[PDB]
Design a protein around this ligand. Structure first.
Ligand code: HEM
Ligand code: HEM
Ligand SMILES: *[C@@H]1O[C@H](CO)[C@@H](O[C@@H]2O[C@H](CO)[C@@H](O[C@@H]3O[C@H](CO)[C@@H](O)[C@H](O)[C@@H]3O)[C@H](O)[C@H]2NC(C)=O)[C@H](O)[C@H]1NC(C)=O
Ligand SMILES: *[C@@H]1O[C@H](CO)[C@@H](O[C@@H]2O[C@H](CO)[C@@H](O[C@@H]3O[C@H](CO)[C@@H](O)[C@H](O)[C@@H]3O)[C@H](O)[C@H]2NC(C)=O)[C@H](O)[C@H]1NC(C)=O
Lengths: 190, 190
């Protein structure tokens, strides 16, 4: 599949991403402006908009299960529970030990039909194994879905069973940056 | 997703198609030589290679559930049961009302881990509503998966419940034609 540009109609945040038509989950990503001098930013903002039947969602930021930073999240009542994880060998991903801070942003909304997780991921483009993503280039992201609850919903490091579905999409990171990024951080669409 | 060319590692048949990594089902298509002085053939040869947990598989020849020719198949014991179907509004597809002949080819196998349906589909590129596919250009195919048995597996027109997954892939039909098509019909890889 291929990502495209879209706007969140309630927040006005502009993302790059996709909606999976099977589970009707939307994945969106937006990056701070590219730099002219120096290193690129290592953070981005993302969103997951999922029907409540979605019991947990994962994002594989290198587009594969193993050897890349994983984001996992689920609704626990009126709360989003989330973590950064890492996997080797196709087994239960465990707590990431690198430098990454996953922040739930105030736009996050949970209602009777959907959970909408809006997050900031600082340090998430470069991982402690030396890999990461090139925000000037084209790459692949992947998502993982389950309709079965995690083993302990109040624990961010809960174990859980393998996803019931997973999928991929191409993304042109060079067109995924926004001049309004800082405004998103202040809760402004611009 | 995107189709590519591949070779059946048992028969040597060359197909165009994909392997869905989630359910590990391979979908393959091959067409007769392109004509330039006549209208195109309306038939093709296809294959479904599916792990036994796949209780039914559908192929949507126009890339969508409704108003296009669908192919549905499942293993019942040591035999493949299959049908041509049609749907008008996201409900149980029923028997196609046009002229189309689905023939199981002898390369078809069923064993303990997989069922492999190799078939001939005559009258399958042009449909009795005036629609169809253009085998000289680019199009989209779709598939449907379920891991729940059909209601009555010995009946080709059995009802069943909605797929648990579905997906799409782009296919360049202009690249999917083969000089070996007639050989395939005779059971030869050529
Ligand atoms: C105990 C939990 C998990 C188990 C046992 C597990 C197991 C597996 C297995 C066996 C596969 C191969 C499937 C195939 O190709 O047929 C796979 C694929 C994959 N998994 Fe998981 N998984 C789990 C959690 C996760 C998480 C939480 C994520 C993302 C945050 C994820 C992302 C993926 C992706 C993207 C693939 C396909 C690409 C690749 O093969 O790496 N998995 N997983
Ligand atoms: C009793 C059986 C079936 C029911 C109730 C049914 C129902 C549905 C529904 C409700 C959707 C929309 C899902 C969404 O977008 O969230 C859908 C999509 C789809 N269905 Fe089915 N389905 C069934 C059988 C089949 C079969 C046999 C095929 C293929 C031979 C098929 C192919 C598709 C495809 C490819 C899509 C996605 C594209 C589209 O929206 O047209 N369906 N189906
Ligand atoms: C729970 O939250 C979800 C996600 O925010 C709500 O679905 C979203 O509802 C908005 C309506 O504010 C939809 O936005 C668009 O609104 C315009 C109105 O001009 C309309 O023209 C568009 O067709 C579209 O509806 C948005 O599409 C929709 N998103 C999804 C994924 O369904 C949902 O309504 C909330 N549920 C409750 C009970 O409040
Ligand atoms: C049950 O049916 C399945 C599906 O046809 C069989 O799996 C397939 O078996 C072939 C034969 O060994 C596999 O071989 C491949 O062979 C080529 C030819 O040299 C080789 O280059 C490839 O690297 C590969 O090893 C084929 O991959 C495999 N396909 C799938 C989807 O599993 C299975 O062997 C059958 N079981 C029995 C007991 O007959």
């Amino acid at each position: 599949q291929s990502a495209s540009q879209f706007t969140d109609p309630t927040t006005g945040f502009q993302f790059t991403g996709i909606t999976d038509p099977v589970h009707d989950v939307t994945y969106g990503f937006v990056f701070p402006p590219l730099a002219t001098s120096g290193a690129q930013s290592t953070e981005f903002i993302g969103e997951v908009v999922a029907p409540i039947a979605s019991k947990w969602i994962g994002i594989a930021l290198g587009g594969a299960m193993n050897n890349d930073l994983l984001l996992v999240a689920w609704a626990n009542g009126n709360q989003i529970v989330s973590s950064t994880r890492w996997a080797t060998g196709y087994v239960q991903p465990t707590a990431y030990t690198g430098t990454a801070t996953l922040t739930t942003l105030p736009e996050t909304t949970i209602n009777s039909t959907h959970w909408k997780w809006v997050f900031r991921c600082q340090g998430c483009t470069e991982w402690n194994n030396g890999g990461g993503i090139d925000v000037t280039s084209q790459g692949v992201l992947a998502w993982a879905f389950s309709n079965v609850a995690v083993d302990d919903p109040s624990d961010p490091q809960s174990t859980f069973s393998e996803h019931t579905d997973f999928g991929f999409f191409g993304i042109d990171y060079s067109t995924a940056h926004s001049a309004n990024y800082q405004n998103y951080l202040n809760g402004d669409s611009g």
